[PDB]
Specification:
2 copies of one chain form a homodimer.
Chain A lengths: L2 E2 L11 E7 L2 H11 L9 H5 L12 H12 L7 E9 L8 E12 L3 E9 L5 E10 L6 E2 L7 E3 L1
Antiparallel strand pairs in A: 1-7, 2-4, 3-6, 4-5, 5-6
Amino acid sequence: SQVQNIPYAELEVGQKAEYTSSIAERDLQLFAAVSGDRNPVHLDAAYAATTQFKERIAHGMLSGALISAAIATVLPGPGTIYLGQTLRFTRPVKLGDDLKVELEVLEKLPKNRVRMATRVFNQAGKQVVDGEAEIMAPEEKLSVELAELPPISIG
Amino acid sequence: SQVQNIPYAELEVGQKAEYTSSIAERDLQLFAAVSGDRNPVHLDAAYAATTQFKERIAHGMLSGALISAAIATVLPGPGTIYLGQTLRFTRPVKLGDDLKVELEVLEKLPKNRVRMATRVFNQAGKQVVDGEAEIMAPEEKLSVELAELPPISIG
């Protein structure tokens, strides 16, 4: 399929969208690989078993990654420019959690700018991240084929 | 292999550290994989060649991932609790850029709270990200063996 954006003129204050992701081993490994954060509580099950969490946990900033993809692919979607992001990390995310990013349009501002609430909840409905984004929303309507990745093999 | 943290009592206001990374094709693909942001300006060279950028560009939030690793592995390092992060995306990051994360201790506050400047610069010394982290620095000295990444093959 193709992904259609929601340009500035069509956005409304209060408009919401959601973006969901499971927290699997592969997510922990991919985020470590691209961040360089090889702390063993995210990677080494034997190590994590010795910690207070008893199992591996996700990097806090994995939620910033998910938020950015929600904004870029769902609301407003293709053509958006990222100007800023604030994150508050409220609760840890554990291996085997499922996260839901909730976006909400808070304000429409000059120069096609939008303030977007960016919240993340886990499978129990508890908020794990709170924050807000500043973006420049797309001026024109757009339909874009997202790129398919090559196969990525781990282990 | 081994990494020592820098506990709250060891930190001093003005203390700096750095964390560097080159922006390779693999980084674009892995970040897209873990985030879900597969917009083609990040992944498809033929497409990006048709844009103003003339080449692929990195996801803005890739700098957020690198900052988070710098805090978690270099300063204060293992044991740090990530409470908050602000990011202002001041300049696009391109394929083939070298990024330098600069961390600076701005303030030490009660209950092990630290305010940290988190700036990111490209190869030409232009600032590409500005922001500040709020953390709880570790109370005790820890030495940790970082985990190995599993092997990751792409394509």
